Ligand binder design. Structure first.
Ligand code: MG
Length: 174
């Protein structure tokens, strides 16, 4: 089922790499990425090998420029398919402070503005109770993205963020 294609140049041109499973390192096959086709599944694609650096979530679709997936540069070199639980449930708890302290909020819905809904622009810890979610550094699902597909996150670095800025979040739905 799951299949993704990476191209070096815009508009599905240039050297190409295809992947139907996780790939921790494709840098030897491809030196840059400027377009992607996702034929099936939803994929997390990462700037550096072993799922490091900037990351981005792409559902099925055609992406003729990296700006189409909110890419931040022309570098990609690892990818993995997002596993959506068959049960189809989503619930997250967000916390004001690290280590699950401070004010907590629980939700099963998306949040395009944490400031509007919860009066925060940083989240310092999180429990993903059900499902798979994405945190964004900017409002309304803009900017750098962080995949939350583990259960517990005691500090922002646990979701890959050097910054505590989180201004929106949403679920990855099938
Ligand atoms: Mg709302």
């Amino acid at each position: 089922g799951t299949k993704i294609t990476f191209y070096e140049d815009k508009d599905f041109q240039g050297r190409r790499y295809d992947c139907d499973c996780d790939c921790a390192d494709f840098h030897t096959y491809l030196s840059r990425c400027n377009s992607i086709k996702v034929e099936g599944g939803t994929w997390a694609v990462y700037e550096r090998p072993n799922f490091a650096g900037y990351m981005y979530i792409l559902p099925q679709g055609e992406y003729p420029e990296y700006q189409r997936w909110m890419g931040l540069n022309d570098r990609l070199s690892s990818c993995r398919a997002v596993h959506l639980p068959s049960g189809g449930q989503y619930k997250i708890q967000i916390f004001e402070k690290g280590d699950f302290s401070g004010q907590m909020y629980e939700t099963t819905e998306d949040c395009p503005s944490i400031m509007e809904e919860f009066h925060m622009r940083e989240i310092h810890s999180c429990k993903v109770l059900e499902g798979v979610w994405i945190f964004y550094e900017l409002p309304d699902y803009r900017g750098r993205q962080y995949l939350l597909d583990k259960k517990e996150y005691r500090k922002p670095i646990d979701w890959g963020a050097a910054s505590p800025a989180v201004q929106s979040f949403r679920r990855i739905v099938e």
